[PDB]
Design a protein around this nucleic acid. Structure first.
Ligand SMILES: [Mg+2]
Ligand SMILES: [Zn+2]
Ligand SMILES: [Zn+2]
Lengths: 140, 391, 147, 56, 49, 69, 115, 49, 184, 32, 262
RNA sequence: CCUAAGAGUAC
């Protein structure tokens, strides 16, 4: 339930490509220079411009309380409190590759229904990321 | 019924209309269309024949053929085009249509997958919904041209544990191809699971295409002004090169390639130049075509059409050939009485520089008619000879 | 079949409420698959559909002679003068839900011929019937209840 | 060739084919009239004495 | 009826496999229809004025 | 043969606009499109229903009746 | 020949009922209701009004074949809420909305003078 | 609109298809294949009308 | 059409002029008193000629008079045509669309189609259903198929009013949508 | 038009064709 | 409170209105019910006594079946399927008679004005063929040469357009929503510019054009449907809309009745 | 009923 990863990124490039609703953004972490992000975002549902600051968090579950998906997704009832309430853009995906980029750097690949993400950084702060499902939460 | 896959065991479903109704995927082994084709039905009259018909000749058992150790049935026609349009990254499905598509899958386990996008609006992608039809435990990894682990072009295919990780689903994935989804599923889970996969994929993709729509029209065969001007420039450049070759040959300055006469070398050069002209004009047109072009979408999916169809419809029909040669001099030293004697220009000997959109001049129409006549004669002779040879 | 070699049999028959409809309430008399167009390259089918649309809207006869100076651009401009999309595409709505179709449909009048090959004259079944006098095998032909 | 290697057989039907996206891969749509003409001999068994009777 | 009354027949076998008589010859321009012929064994052998 | 009662696509009644159409073409010297618009046929389905009709019954009426009373 | 009578599209046959409910074994508190002699006209309306409900977790319909006029509607609600009750509430809301629309249309038509 | 040009034989409308033939009283010279001892043949289908 | 030197204009021109066309039009309108100007009048005055395949070997023909007879900002939508770069014509085509037969003259825009499709339609328009004769009610034919509401095509050729196609049509104008609607 | 010796256009060629079909017909070869 | 309506054009055979504060499903269901679910009177049985015309008997029967008939009080009539008579009676059918003779040397046009009602309507407002043109002659049924006769009797039952399109009282129903494509329910096909190549609908005057810079509204549902209903003539178009709403409500009430009684 | 011929249907 807790945040596996959290950082602040600056967007250097927005690549529409052939798509009208999805754009691939590259971002560089503003604190750790060894952390970089490639991410497909629905710009129609969450507009992103170049040189934009995004707070990015990767978590295992959205519930505030610690874990005691396998349960069918339910529409959010009124009064439901979740981590997504604090962010603007939330996606859910699976980790499908862990690559050893270098001695310290590792890369984690996520697929949110076909929207691809690659997060690269030293293993000292990316160690909480493991092969399972995750939620990606982005705020401006 | 040239092969054993053209004679297969089906299960009866009684319907209130005067036609045999069969799945679209099973028409490929039968080589069957619906433009008047007639098909035959035989009923076993004993338990032994019935049992061996169900256990040996059943359609699911014939999915992978011994002919090419690859599936003979696959996703074809509309279901193919839709499955390319549904699995695009742009394709996002809202809650209501997601629920309908999930219910349309007969063996859906009853759990709603978590949306690919949760906030600010719950949206599912087409890959997520199509992964429901894919049986659990299937891993497929095909790397197309230039694809990386990240897919900027969304080409290739990666499916992990029944979930489409990435890749646009098209003819290479759900078609009758070796190493595709059909082959992997029938070699991992069984022919019954493969047939059920056929049904599930067809149902979900057909529902999505019904509620999304697909068409084609005259505007899909039209290239814009600059591209048409460049196509005309390419045709003119090719005709000028042909004129230069003709000047060299008529001045005897042309040298014969080893192994053929001077006239054959001249004809070979002219035909090569005209063919590369048509190909270059077609490539210009196809590059011009936007991703929203319907013929482009059909060609990209592989359901129907080819690059040559786009080239002939939009850029240039090309060179008409009879018996592997250009249009012969039926009249004395000339193709038609509308041309002067000894004219070896592209238009005189059957080059159709006009596209089907622009129409054909009468001489081009007659030459194209000659080419089509040769094609029809060849088709008839070929089918007769192949029947004899097969017997 | 159209006048361009586009033969085909009726797959299913939908009622008017199930057919897709334009913003003017017009429903098609026929729905044909797009996939019949690219491989067969029957561009004349599309051109004649556009010309027939223009002719029906304007009341003049569509001159579809082969080697005349009638271009697709002129027909498209005439159609645009009539308030329709120049290439014949129309925004159609799904008949089951009323929602807009994401893709616009090529729509217009086209001349179709009904061919002599009806299904009722070709359906034939035989479990047991007349037998040949010499070989004691079932007779030949559906007119004789053959096999 | 015309009577031994290949012969005309009974319990066979022939008709035009149309596509059905709502049918299974192994399922074939059979017209009701064709189903009424083509027949299968089912041996009367204690397990299926009832339903066969209903068909009779 | 109009096509049948202006039909021409070439009495060259029909089961032969040499394609030259069936080809649309250049001298056929304006005398017989370039594209009107059966697709079967009678391709090119049956011509229409 | 004879003018169809209803437009095939939408179902608007066009069988009552044939003689009016012929009168407009003959007496008022109008062109086809203006006459079609005057009769109220605004959708090209009805316009093609009335415009493309071939009144073969006039031919059939030239033959003497098979059974004359 | 094999053409079915058209009235089979809206007339209930002998020995069959308008609605039949089967519990769904895939998910808890889920039912599948088969509607006979109905089509998309009712299916889409019922599905939308069911999706308007806050306690409905899943609501979908499908016409398994255009040949036969019938559709299956799957409804899954939260614990303690009968899916039949959800169907009841959806139908009630549809009736109320249709009555309001008929009243409003009558009132608006009565304002015309050129009709 | 009936154009004629047909016969009524036993009540059935029969049309005579135009029979194609090689023209008479014309000299035609054809090359022959390698196995044949004759290389070129000049023939005329001489016929008096 | 016969082409003569026409020394007055100094260039090759058709022997037929607007006066002969006017006389032909007058005869056609009167048919719907002047001296009759029929096809035999053009034949007997040296205006039109009959050329067979043997004589056609020794003539040069102009496909159209307007683009080939007169000696030499174009529409980009038009098809590409050539002027043949020669002025020695002896005869002129009356109209190119006259190379097609009865079945092919029914095809709308046959030059925009692939030729096997034209052949398919030609072999398939004979199987088309319509009105074969107006006196079908008094004929005891073995089999007759008649359309309820034959319609003349919206896309019609100039050569099909000599074939009486608008009087005896063999088809209907149906509103067609080219769509992947239901997969059926 | 006014000039009796003026050259004809492509449209005028359909008059001559009409004249041809006025005197020959469609089955003129059979009848002749 | 609920679905709101504002009507733009009121004609004898057309009504053009706006349907606001309603779901897309409800608007589509109303359109479908109007197309196919409204009961109407039309000729269903034809007994041909004399036919010396050039038209086939079933040809004339098919033409007669397509003749629009007045159906204002069609709800008072009963279906022939649920009536206690043997074949047809006065509580479930209207009897017309078409009797024509060619006593004129010119062509005699047999119209629908010669359709004479024989059965006693019992004061209802059904049976009459709908006359629209100013000449007074209805749909041209047949033509007679001199000496030709056509005598026949028509039994007209009530029916809905689902059973046969001859019972459809709705003609063409124009149905449009979101003219500015603000919901992005369509991806416009274009060559150069989608705005220029796609003509603006007449309904675009009734909505605010987009600001071209505002972000896409993902919370916006579908409402404000511009609908134009046309009447063949059997019932007034306002009655078409009212009866369509009534029939949809009846279907929903029947679902409730079945659920409650089971 | 047999034979022959012709016209087509889908490859
Ligand atoms: Mg076929
Ligand atoms: Zn209409
Ligand atoms: Zn009664």
């Amino acid at each position: 339930s807790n945040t596996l990863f959290d950082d602040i990124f600056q967007v250097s490039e927005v690549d529409p490509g052939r798509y009208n609703k999805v754009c691939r953004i590259e971002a560089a972490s503003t604190t750790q220079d060894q952390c970089k992000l490639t991410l497909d975002i629905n710009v129609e549902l969450f507009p992103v411009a170049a040189q934009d600051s995004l707070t990015v968090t990767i978590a295992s579950s959205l519930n505030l309380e610690d874990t005691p998906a396998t349960r069918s997704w339910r529409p959010p009832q009124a009064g439901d409190r979740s981590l997504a309430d604090d962010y603007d853009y939330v996606m859910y995906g699976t980790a499908y590759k862990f690559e050893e980029v270098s001695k310290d750097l590792i890369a984690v690949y996520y697929s949110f229904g076909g929207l691809l993400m690659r997060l690269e950084g030293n293993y000292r702060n990316l160690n909480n990321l493991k092969q399972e499902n995750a939620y990606l939460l982005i705020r401006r | 019924s040239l092969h054993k896959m053209s004679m297969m065991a089906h299960r009866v479903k009684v319907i209130p209309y005067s036609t045999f109704r069969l799945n679209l995927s099973v028409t490929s082994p039968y080589n069957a269309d619906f433009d008047g084709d007639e098909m035959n039905l035989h009923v076993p009259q004993s338990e032994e024949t019935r049992a061996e018909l169900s256990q040996l000749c059943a359609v699911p058992l014939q999915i992978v053929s011994p002919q090419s150790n690859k599936p003979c049935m696959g996703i074809v026609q509309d279901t193919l085009c839709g499955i390319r349009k549904l699995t695009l990254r742009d394709t996002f499905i809202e809650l209501d249509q997601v629920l309908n598509m999930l219910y349309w899958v007969p063996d859906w386990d009853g759990v709603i997958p978590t949306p690919a996008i949760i906030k600010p609006k719950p949206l599912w992608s087409g890959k997520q919904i199509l992964s429901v039809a894919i049986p659990n435990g299937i891993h497929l990894q095909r790397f197309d041209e230039g694809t990386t682990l990240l897919s900027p072009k969304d080409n290739g295919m990666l499916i992990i544990d029944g979930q489409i990780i990435f890749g646009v689903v098209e003819k290479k994935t759900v078609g009758s191809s070796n190493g595709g989804l059909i082959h992997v599923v029938t070699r991992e889970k069984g022919p019954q699971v493969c047939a059920k996969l056929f049904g599930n994929i067809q149902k979900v993709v057909n529902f999505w295409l019904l509620h999304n729509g697909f068409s084609t029209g005259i505007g899909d065969t039209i290239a814009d002004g600059p591209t048409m001007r460049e196509i005309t420039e390419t045709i003119a450049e090719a005709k000028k090169k042909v004129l230069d070759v003709t000047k060299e040959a008529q001045a005897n300055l042309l040298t014969a390639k080893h192994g053929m006469t001077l006239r054959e070398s001249f004809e070979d050069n002219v035909v090569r130049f005209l063919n590369e002209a048509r190909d270059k004009a077609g490539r210009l047109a196809e590059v011009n075509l936007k991703d929203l072009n319907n013929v482009k979408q059909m060609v990209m999916a592989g359901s129907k059409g080819s690059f040559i169809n786009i080239a002939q419809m939009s850029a240039c029909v090309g060179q008409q050939s009879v018996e592997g040669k250009r249009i012969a001099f039926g009249f004395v030293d000339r193709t038609l009485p509308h041309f002067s004697k000894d004219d070896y220009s592209p238009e005189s000997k059957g080059f159709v520089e006009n596209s089907y959109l622009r129409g054909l001049t009468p001489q081009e129409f007659f030459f194209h008619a000659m080419g089509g006549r040769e094609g029809l004669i060849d088709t008839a002779v070929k089918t007769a000879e192949t029947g004899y040879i097969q017997r | 079949a159209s006048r361009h070699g586009q033969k085909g049999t009726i797959g299913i028959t939908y009622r008017r409420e199930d057919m897709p409809f334009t913003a003017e309430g017009i429903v098609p008399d026929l729905i044909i698959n797009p996939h019949a167009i690219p491989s067969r390259m029957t561009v004349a089918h599309l051109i004649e559909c556009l010309l027939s649309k223009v002719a029906a809207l304007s009341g003049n006869e569509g001159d579809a002679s082969p080697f005349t100076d009638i271009t697709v651009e002129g027909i498209s401009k005439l159609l645009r003068e009539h308030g329709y999309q120049s290439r014949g595409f129309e925004v159609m709505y799904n008949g089951h839900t009323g929602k807009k179709l994401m893709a616009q449909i090529f729509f217009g009048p086209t001349y179709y011929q009904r061919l002599r090959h009806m299904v009722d004259d070709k359906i034939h079944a035989r479990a047991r019937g007349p037998m040949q006098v010499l070989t004691r095998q079932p007779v030949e032909g559906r007119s004789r209840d053959g096999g | 060739r015309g009577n031994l290697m290949g012969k005309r057989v009974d319990f066979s039907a022939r008709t035009v084919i149309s596509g059905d996206p709502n049918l299974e891969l192994d399922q074939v749509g059979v017209p009701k009239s064709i189903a009424k003409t083509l027949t299968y001999p089912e041996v009367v068994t204690p397990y299926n004495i009832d339903r066969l009777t209903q068909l009779v | 009826t109009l096509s049948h009354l202006r039909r021409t027949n070439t009495p060259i076998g029909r089961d032969g496999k040499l394609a030259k008589p069936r080809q649309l010859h250049n001298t056929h321009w304006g005398l017989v229809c370039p594209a009107e012929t059966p697709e079967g064994q009678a391709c090119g052998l049956v011509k229409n004025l | 043969m004879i003018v169809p009662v209803r437009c095939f696509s939408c179902g608007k009644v066009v069988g009552d606009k044939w003689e009016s159409y012929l009168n407009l073409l003959q007496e008022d010297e109008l062109d086809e499109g203006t006459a079609l618009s005057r009769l109220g046929l605004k959708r090209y389905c009805c316009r093609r229903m009335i415009l493309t009709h071939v009144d073969l019954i006039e031919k059939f009426l030239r033959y003497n009746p098979l059974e004359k009373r | 020949m094999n053409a079915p009578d058209r009235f089979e599209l809206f007339l209930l046959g002998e020995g069959e009922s308008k609605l039949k409910i089967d519990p769904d074994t895939k998910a808890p508190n889920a039912v599948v209701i088969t509607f006979e002699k109905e089509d998309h006209t009712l299916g889409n309306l019922i599905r939308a009004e069911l999706l308007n409900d806050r306690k409905v977790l899943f609501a979908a319909y499908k016409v398994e074949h255009p040949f036969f006029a019938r559709f299956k509607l799957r409804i899954q609600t939260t614990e303690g809420y009968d899916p039949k009750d959800a169907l009841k509430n959806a139908c009630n809301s549809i009736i109320n909305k249709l009555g309001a629309l008929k009243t409003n249309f009558e009132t608006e038509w009565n304002l015309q003078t050129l009709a | 609109f009936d154009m004629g040009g047909y016969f009524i034989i036993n009540g059935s409308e029969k049309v005579l298809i135009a029979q194609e033939r090689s023209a008479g009283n014309i000299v035609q010279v054809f090359k022959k294949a390698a196995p044949s001892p004759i290389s070129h043949v000049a023939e005329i289908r001489s016929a008096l009308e | 059409f016969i082409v003569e030197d026409d020394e007055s204009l100094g260039h090759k021109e058709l022997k037929v002029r607007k006066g002969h066309i006017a006389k032909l039009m007058a005869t056609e309108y009167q048919d719907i008193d002047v001296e009759e100007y029929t096809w035999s009048s053009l034949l007997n005055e040296g205006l039109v000629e009959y050329i067979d395949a043997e004589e056609e070997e020794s003539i040069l023909i102009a496909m159209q008079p307007e683009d080939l007879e007169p000696a030499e900002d174009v529409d980009p939508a038009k098809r590409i045509r050539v002027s043949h770069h020669a002025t020695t014509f002896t005869h002129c085509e009356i109209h190119p669309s006259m190379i097609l037969g009865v079945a092919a003259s029914i095809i709308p825009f046959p030059d925009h189609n692939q030729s096997p499709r034209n052949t398919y339609q030609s072999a398939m328009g004979k199987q088309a259903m319509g009105v074969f004769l107006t006196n079908y009610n008094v004929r005891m034919d073995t089999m007759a198929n008649i359309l309820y509401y034959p319609q003349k095509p919206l896309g019609t050729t100039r050569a099909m009013e000599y074939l009486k196609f608008r009087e005896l049509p063999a088809g209907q104008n149906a509103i067609v949508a080219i769509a992947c609607y239901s997969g059926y | 038009f006014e000039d009796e010796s003026a050259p004809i256009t492509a449209e005028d060629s359909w008059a001559v064709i009409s004249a041809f079909f006025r005197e020959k017909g469609l089955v003129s070869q059979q009848l002749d | 409170e609920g679905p709101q309506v504002k009507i733009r054009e009121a004609s004898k055979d057309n009504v053009d209105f706006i349907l606001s504060n309603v779901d897309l499903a409800m608007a589509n269901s109303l359109r479908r019910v109007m197309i196919a679910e409204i009961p109407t009177l039309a000729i269903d049985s034809v007994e041909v006594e004399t036919n010396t015309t050039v038209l086939a008997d079933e040809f004339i029967a098919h033409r007669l079946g397509l003749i629009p008939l007045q159906s204002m009080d069609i709800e008072q009539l009963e279906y022939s399927r649920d009536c206690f008579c043997e074949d047809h009676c006065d509580k479930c059918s209207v009897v017309l008679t078409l009797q024509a003779f060619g006593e004129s040397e010119s062509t005699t046009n047999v119209y629908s004005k010669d359709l004479v009602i024989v059965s006693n309507l019992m004061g209802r407002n059904i049976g009459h063929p709908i006359i629209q043109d100013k000449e007074g002659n209805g749909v041209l049924i047949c033509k007679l040469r001199k000496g030709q006769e056509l005598k026949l009797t028509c039994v007209a039952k009530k029916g809905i357009a689902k059973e046969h399109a001859k019972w459809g009282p709705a003609a063409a129903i124009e149905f449009e929503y979101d003219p500015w494509n603000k919901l992005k329910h369509t991806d416009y096909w274009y060559e150069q510019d989608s705005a220029k190549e796609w003509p603006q609908s007449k309904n675009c005057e009734y909505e605010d054009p987009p600001n071209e810079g505002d972000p896409f509204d993902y919370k916006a549902q579908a409402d404000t449907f511009y609908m134009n209903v046309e009447s063949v003539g059997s019932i007034p178009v306002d009655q078409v809309v009212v009866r369509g709403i009534d029939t949809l409500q009846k279907k929903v009430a029947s679902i409730l009745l079945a659920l409650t009684q089971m």
